[model samples]
Target: EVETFAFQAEIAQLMSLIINTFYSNKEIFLRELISNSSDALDKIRYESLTDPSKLDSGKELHINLIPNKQDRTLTIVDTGIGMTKADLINNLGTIAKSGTKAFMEALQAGADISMIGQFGVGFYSAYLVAEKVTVITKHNDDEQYAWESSAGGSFTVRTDTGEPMGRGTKVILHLKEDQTEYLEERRIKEIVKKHSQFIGYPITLFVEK
Candidate 1:
């Protein structure tokens, strides 16, 4: 898998603004990611009845939140329709598919900016908490791939290093010191309920006792 290009100037500025200004609360990061996972599960489930092979082998469609204080990392794992290398590049690296122009046009035309996420910028919210993010994914249609990015400028994609875990994705966040709140079990659960309780799939947290 090849690497993707750097974000454009305006897109970079927009990212900076979102990270620094748009989101008033840091806790919302988990919510956004969980919401995304829920959506993914819902998608695969819907596709399953129509295309049976699209479903993983009896794997439940759910989201898992695991926090490792020892490593200062928080991981969100899901069993859904995973992305291929091209999907990773197109979905993560560039905002070309986000309809930014149309979203801006709507805002200018008096439509609310809140609808921006509907265009698919939700995945990028992971950058707000972690300095670096690692995405391990396997798809039914292609081999597994790993996508790593610091969101500073560039990102790298290569064939996956770990064992293939069926058709799904695991997003590992190397959390910053200031973003340690995400490592708490209670806080994560609360965020999941507040923003994602109504989500279409089950959301669970793995807490080390």
Candidate 2:
């Protein structure tokens, strides 16, 4: 059964700052997300070194992008290590380095958007363009779950009753009104070439029939 979870007060406050105040532009969302996918892939690859079956056998480590013009949504899927419900809870709400006085002062300075880079995990960047973001993920040790947020101060987590991905994560971005440019195939390819071509894994865009 699906369940709902809420972000702590602190994380909710941070999201207000991150989404409403941070980000240089919406396109950076693609780069940061792909970077996160790469890190998850790297993590699983390294962990497999200690034990071959740390994951499913012969798993293909790759990325897939699907754009739906009808709904104006962009989905990024990766066969990488995923997080458990608890992990997703903490990670989704985490502030990486928001504790220091430097960060506090930076928060007050409206344009100190680059401060987000210091956090490394840029999942929040997705909100710059997406009105609703849903992450469906499955960890090797945990069942699939859906994590969703509307760039609001709080997010919800629920069980994914859909077909399961044996491992990895999929983020479905419901683009904002003016963000339809993200639904363009040509534009996405350009973004990858300019921002994420350096990533180790192969990133593929699926063409619909």
Candidate 3:
């Protein structure tokens, strides 16, 4: 069944804070997203140690970047431990715990949100360069699902009945008109090399430069 979730009232304010705070450093969006992909890849590898089937046979462990000028979008795809439907709602939909009040205060006061130890907060950085964000994920023992939101007051998730997405997550960002630089191959490569040069997993951009 499809589901809809209303974000915490603070999320709208928090998202704008993120954009204004990082406006001068919009490229960090890619860095944070790629770092998330690398973290997901590492998690699946660790899980495979205890449950071999979790490896999802024949799927190579890697991150693929796709920048589509036609769609004015950038997608970060990873063959990692994907999320369950609940995770889509919990991880991406909500921000943090009861401490959200303090978290929002910190963000407003120019304190680093990362220092607060919130899970999946970095994922919200997508709103910095995107007008809308879609996450399609498939976990080892869960059905695939598509999560969509535009940093608005609510988001939606539905079962994906199309071709299997394998065992990983794909985050697609619909670039805001002024943020289309993310769709450029050269700009993306430079950002990857500058910010994610130390990432262990292979990050391949689909186009040849």
Candidate 4:
């Protein structure tokens, strides 16, 4: 079954600001996504200390980036704490009941945080270069599911019947024609080095000769 939802009012406003006003710093989208993966990894690792069931997959915590020139997509996969069906709708579909508004208010106060995950609006930055975004996620407690959006007024969530996935999340970005640079290994390497060099987990990229 599939479900679709309209973006909350504040999320629409926040996405507009990110896509229009923050266009100048488009490269930071990589940084923002990597940071999000890192936080999810941290979350699972932290939880595992108290409840070992969370690490049942026994997969090493890491992030993998695959840029496919043929498909014109950049896939960022993380072996981290994945989300449930409700999580997709609540966390990605809506912004925690005006969290973006509060974030903007905090930004006005000059609050300093290195990553944008706290505001939960960073995920929308995928729209800066992607015409469509697909998230395949599997949580330890739930079956694998997919969340898809075109950065429009509404997004969809459905049970993923594709390849089976372990506990983690995979974000596949269907790049815009002009944003093909993101599919280049050289460009991705440069961006990761400059922005996510200090990330705690391993970040690997697939490159072909």
Candidate 5:
């Protein structure tokens, strides 16, 4: 149940930009990750209309954040459709849509990775603030799995060995040493309210700014 994956051709090139150059200013990572979670919940909710059994009809929808100070980690959890083994590869894999090779070639030839979010590759923005990222997810009708990446050239996915999330996904970001300011709930809450409270889902962040 252990598998290793190389970043998609486009992702590999773009990843080199984030990894090699320290993108310390992309504070939009939090907004980007939450937008992804919000989309997942919407997709599942829409599908439940046709197959109500696919999800617990009565479970309240919400997004949650939990911080582990000792662990220097911030966790974002959402109740939504989880991914299957193949889903992980296909979904998080092949990350960019158009001209990633060209982009990478340009980046290599002296272009900027600053336009990361423009192409819907916001996930890589996570690398801006976190040294490591772990995603634990469970689909309503499938087994749980974990995906890990150090924001380098490759990432891994494996059968989850820990307790499962009944449904949905959880992302843990190990904040970079100099980036622990994200540990404050108040700061995170403001970020959410200012940048994303209008996302149409209940998002609650746990900690003090």
Candidate 6:
């Protein structure tokens, strides 16, 4: 069997920029994440209207944030379309869509670099503050799987042993020591409102004391 190759040099640099210095306001991370969740919820809702069975899963479309100060962990959960093992690898590992190539071409043509988000690299933003990130996701058509990565050029995907949460996805962030500010409720709320208040989905925060 032929082994797969990793990202090319330009792609690697792009990833580094996205994971390192793209967002000037680190707080904007919450907004970006919530925005993504809202998008997922909207997609599922649209699908449900066409197929009632799509909503058979016992869950509402909402975004939940759980912060654990003691462990320095932040969990963002969403009741939306989740991912499978292949999705975890392909989506998280390499740039699969045509938009990536277009974005690269635009950059080479001296176009604004800020247009990179059109390529769907927003998911990797979690690695900016997380030393380790874990994803627990269940798709309507596939079993739940746990995807984990440290953004150190490698990742792991495995079947989850716990009971599936009907549907949706959960992202657990093992935050870096300097990123503890993200654990604050006020800060998170502010970030969400600033970036995703207009999004068509409910966003909630769960605090554990």
Which candidate leads in TM-score?
A: 4
The local distance difference test score of each candidate is 0.74, 0.78, 0.80, 0.83, 0.77, 0.72
Q: Count the backbone clashes (under 3 Å) in each candidate.
A: 0, 0, 0, 0, 3, 0
Residue 209 accuracy (lDDT) in model 4:
47
Alpha carbon lDDT of residue 147, candidate 2?
88
Cα distance off (Å), candidate 1, residue 91: 5.3
User: So what's the TM-score on candidate 1?
Assistant: 0.84
C-alpha RMSD by candidate, in order: 3.0, 2.6, 2.7, 2.7, 3.0, 3.6
Worst 10 residues of 6 by lDDT: 1-10
lDDT of 4 by residue, 1-209 (tens): 78888878777766665556534557778888888899889999999999988898755899999999889999999999999887888755454556677777776697533334577767877888888899999999898999888865788889999998788999999998989999998899999999899999999999954
Error of 4 at 27 (Å): 0.5
Cα displacement (Å) at residue 157, model 5: 1.3
lDDT: which is higher, 3 or 5? 3
Tell me which of candidates 1 and 4 scores higher on lDDT: 4
Off by over 4 Å in 3: 19-22, 91-95, 98-103, 112-120
Stretches off by above 4 angstroms in model 4 are: 91-97, 103-118
**Which has the higher lDDT value, candidate number 2 or candidate number 3?**
3
On lDDT, the leading prediction is 4
Model 5 per-residue lDDT tens digits across residues 51-166: 98877633666799887789999888988787777778785565464646555566677656655555567777777778999999988756889999886678899888897578
- On the 0 to 100 scale, the lDDT of residue 169 in model 5 is 87
lDDT, ranked from best to worst: 4, 3, 2, 5, 1, 6
Looking at candidate 2, the ten consecutive residues that score lowest on lDDT are: 95-104
How many collisions between residues are there in candidate 2?
0
The residue-by-residue lDDT of candidate 2 on 1-209, one tens digit each, is: 55566666655665566567645566888887888899889999999989889766337899999999887889999999988987877754454435433444665775354445455536767777888999999898888899888855567788889987889989999998988898888899899998888889999998655
* Over 4 Å off, model 6: 1-12, 19-23, 91-116
Candidate 3 residue 1 Cα shift, in angstroms, is: 5.6
